[PDB]
Amino acid sequence: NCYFPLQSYGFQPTYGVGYQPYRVVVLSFELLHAPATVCGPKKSTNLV
Amino acid sequence: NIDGYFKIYSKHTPINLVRDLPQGFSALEPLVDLPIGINITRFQTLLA
């Protein structure tokens, strides 16, 4: 009942629709306590 | 340091004087603004 706590993944090109490897990104952000150093792009138009 | 933004304004001007801070007048232009957020309580320079 001792267990080494990790278990390495197995990813072969033969596996079914579940076992296979999927990459993840989480755009985590912690919000609204400080001055801004990022926003999205501020699109613009021709000068009449 | 204003509401989480640091600001530098500066000048360089030519002189000919021996001793004291030259009597006369010029303004400083704003050079750079940075959103650093830190508490500047105190400071030091850097010699070479």
Ligand SMILES: *[C@@H]1O[C@H](CO)[C@@H](O)[C@H](O)[C@H]1NC(C)=O
């Ligand atoms: C600056 O000081 C205030 C007052 O203690 C504090 O609320 C704030 O978190 C401080 N910020 C830093 C980066 O020291």
